[PDB]
Amino acid sequence: KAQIFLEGSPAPLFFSQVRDAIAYARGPEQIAPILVIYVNDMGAAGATWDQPGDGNWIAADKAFYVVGSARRGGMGAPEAVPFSSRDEAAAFVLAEGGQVLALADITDAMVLTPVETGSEPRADDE
């Protein structure tokens, strides 16, 4: 489950699909800025919008994000698995994930590429 609370908006955007709702936070939020996003850690992008099972309750905005390089919409529809435990997100990367970065460190360059051609991460800094 995922929900984003927008600044200026009296109502948060909430859905079961984490990957979907978090996508809205990364684009369709042009209506009102994302103040903070809360997510019910349930696989999110590891699974489908149906999700495996109940896990952690966390604020994705203040948590770890892994953007999948091996399996995800790098040039398409990228999904993010937000997790409270970094090491879990890193394990996801070992399997398929690309980079583990906090939502406070989310760059458009890592979530989506023009092509790839050996592109730089958050700022070629990490």
UniProtKB/Swiss-Prot annotation:
Chief site of localization: membrane
GO (cellular component) term, any one: plasma membrane
Entry keywords, A to Z: Cell membrane, Chaperone, Copper, Lipoprotein, Membrane, Metal-binding, Palmitate, Signal
Membrane topology: Lipid-anchor
Localization annotation: Cell membrane
GO MF term list: metal ion binding
Keyword Transferase appears in the UniProt entry: no
Source species, domain of life: Bacteria
Function field: May act as a metallochaperone involved in nitrous oxide reductase assembly. Specifically binds Cu(+).
Subunit structure: Monomer. Apo-NosL can form homodimers.
Family: Belongs to the NosL family.
Protein name: Copper-binding lipoprotein NosL
Covered range of the whole protein: 53 to 178 of 193
